[PDB]
Amino acid sequence: PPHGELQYLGQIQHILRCGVRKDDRTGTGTLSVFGMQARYSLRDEFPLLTTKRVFWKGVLEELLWFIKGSTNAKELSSKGVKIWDANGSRDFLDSLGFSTREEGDLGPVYGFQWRHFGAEYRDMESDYSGQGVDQLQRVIDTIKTNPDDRRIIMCAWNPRDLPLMALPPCHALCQFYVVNSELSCQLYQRSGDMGLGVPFNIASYALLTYMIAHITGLKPGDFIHTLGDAHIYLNHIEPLKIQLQREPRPFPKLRILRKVEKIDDFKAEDFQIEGYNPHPTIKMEMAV
Amino acid sequence: PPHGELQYLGQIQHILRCGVRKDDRTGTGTLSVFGMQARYSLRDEFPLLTTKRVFWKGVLEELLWFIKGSTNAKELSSKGVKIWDANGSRDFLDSLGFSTREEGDLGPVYGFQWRHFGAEYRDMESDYSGQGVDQLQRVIDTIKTNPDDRRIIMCAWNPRDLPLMALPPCHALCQFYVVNSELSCQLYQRSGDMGLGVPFNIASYALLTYMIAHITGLKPGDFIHTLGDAHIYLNHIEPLKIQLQREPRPFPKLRILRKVEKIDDFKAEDFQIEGYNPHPTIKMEMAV
Numbered sequence A, B: 001p002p003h004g005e006l007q008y009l010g011q012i013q014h015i016l017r018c019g020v021r022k023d024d025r026t027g028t029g030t031l032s033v034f035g036m037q038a039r040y041s042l043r044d045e046f047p048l049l050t051t052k053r054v055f056w057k058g059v060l061e062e063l064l065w066f067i068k069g070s071t072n073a074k075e076l077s078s079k080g081v082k083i084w085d086a087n088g089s090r091d092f093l094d095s096l097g098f099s100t101r102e103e104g105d106l107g108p109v110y111g112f113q114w115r116h117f118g119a120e121y122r123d124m125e126s127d128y129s130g131q132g133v134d135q136l137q138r139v140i141d142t143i144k145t146n147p148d149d150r151r152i153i154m155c156a157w158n159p160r161d162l163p164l165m166a167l168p169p170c171h172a173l174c175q176f177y178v179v180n181s182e183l184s185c186q187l188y189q190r191s192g193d194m195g196l197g198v199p200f201n202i203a204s205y206a207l208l209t210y211m212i213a214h215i216t217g218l219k220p221g222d223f224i225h226t227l228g229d230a231h232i233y234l235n236h237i238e239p240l241k242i243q244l245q246r247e248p249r250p251f252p253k254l255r256i257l258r259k260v261e262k263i264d265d266f267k268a269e270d271f272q273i274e275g276y277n278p279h280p281t282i283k284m285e286m287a288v
Ligand SMILES: Cc1nc(=O)c2cc(CN(C)c3ccc(C(=O)N[C@@H](CCC(=O)O)C(=O)O)s3)ccc2[nH]1
Pocket: A026, A054, A055, A058, A082, A083, A084, A087, A193, A196, A197, A198, A200, A282, A283, A284, A286, A287, A288
């Protein structure tokens, strides 16, 4: 079969060639296409793009960070991953009307929604243990007791909390699916920065599926990536054209070195990416 | 000029050919595939399937019923559309442990979530005016003022309310998009009964897009249908095979018979499907 990475490269080709110029919140301007989907096999291979070196350390730490239910950019930043620090800045928080909010407090985003959906948000320092719906655990439990369930959904998009977010989730929800001992996951990404966030986001959900398959005794199946506003920022056009001239390389594999029982038990050292031979890193300037 | 209906027919082919046997909640059994996407153009045509006659009256009536904010099956039944009566019957309600609920009360379903997301659900007769988030109107307001917004989402999936729903929404959420004066809509349907619900569902959202496009002064663009568990029930394989032998006929057109100002203003007589010439109707027994 063909290299799964060609789907992503193909989506980049399409947007660059046929995407429509669409202004945006950041003011950078974009080339956009509405509605896209790709299927990444998770069977004996891991979808970490090769046409560009993907910041894997960032992916792994962000997910563990999400899993802990943290909304403090400081805690992830202490791991050497600064991807969310800009959004927790004093200046940025103020530009949204969050002047009384401490620096690093991203609001009730991902982690908070996944583990405490519906809980009354105070601040990043608050203890929400036992508050709200722990969707992640409910998803894990359902997969174990009734794998045929067609309602295995973890939703980050919370209408009543959007006002408190420094940035509404680019990932509204994801759905899990089990058939013949294989676990699949589909992500609905309402908005996708193709050159920066997407490659990262793909690896992230592929990792989450591996983690959940591991503790549920299942084999990773497919990761389906569904996009809403799939866009390429104007300043990413040139670097993306360089990346398109690169031939994909066999996807690496992901090894889980230890037998884990609970999702909260995983640690960075538990994972190992082997056979990852990517082309040189390509810098995509952040939009703001 | 590939006919738009070929996508739905191709999805049926794929599932019959590659779908995997998967038991289900109803005990009927299905052929299943996880993750699918189809794009139905809404430009000078309406995607009402022709390889079988679709119950358009039901489609229109159900959507007007959603907009009214109703969660009472009887209010739709009184229009001659009985699609939700079973899910509101005494026996079915009792089977889910809702014996204290009145017959016809579907719980916090679409009507409620769309117009009062977050509000505390009491019963189908309660007045929720001013309670919760009226996502529908907010969506309309944003389309009219900031069309580039990548967060135009209407969510029906509410983790907090699920334990009260007679049937968790098969349509988790939808996202709207605007470019070149065209309004597009993507639906994330977590579970799709390909033979029964899907054809109907596709018409439902195409209609919603036509409605919003009308009140916002935009032209309908694309309707992207995204599926989670796309399945063909076993007792639908024979009739679907017959349907697949039928050549689609040009899609009809949808006419709005007068300038409507507000979404709540639409009445059934404001719409006319013209040039609809479907093949004979194909009954698809309900599963359970
Ligand atoms: C416009 C915009 N696009 C984004 O993709 C985006 C992403 C995040 C958060 N996030 C989920 C991120 C994932 C990956 C990131 C990133 O900057 N990656 C660089 C790595 C450079 C480095 O830190 O060493 C890269 O992949 O090149 S940032 C926050 C705001 C955003 N804003």
